[PDB]
């Protein structure tokens, strides 16, 4: 691919029932959320990914 | 009593309240006595502010 | 009372009437955003803090 930019992630953890707020070069928020939540086995509802 | 010392008495509490209808399902806490949501965490310091 | 000198007691019982709303209409407005993700689990938000 050779994007500019390579692939990149920031995560953030809060400490709070397994929240987690991170910050991704990815067209897919929706899957990096999701594979996020199933790694850490938390509701998808904890993750935040912007 | 004017020379008395401040002397504690015993403290009594009682809380009155209404019990949900009998049949209400467990799922349905509308009604019931749940605790803050945050209150473990407020407990703990996990709780941000 | 009759039998203290230096110390007395007092009672009273009072009663109250509190009315629920913004004075001005416009405040009484409230929002809510809410997300079932593909889990099932749901996100809710709201105006309120």
Known sequence: HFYLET???????????????LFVSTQNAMKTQSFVAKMLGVPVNRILVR | SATLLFQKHPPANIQLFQEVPNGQSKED???????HLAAAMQASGEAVY | NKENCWKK?????????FGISFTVPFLNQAGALIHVYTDGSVLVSHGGT
Do not use: F, W, Y
């Open chain 1, 7 to 21: 692939h990149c992630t920031i995560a953030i953890p809060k400490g709070e029932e397994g929240e987690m707020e």
């Open chain 3, 9 to 17: 007691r007092g009672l009273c019982i009072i009663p109250t009437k």
């Open chain 2, 29 to 35: 806490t509308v009604g019931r006595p749940l605790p």
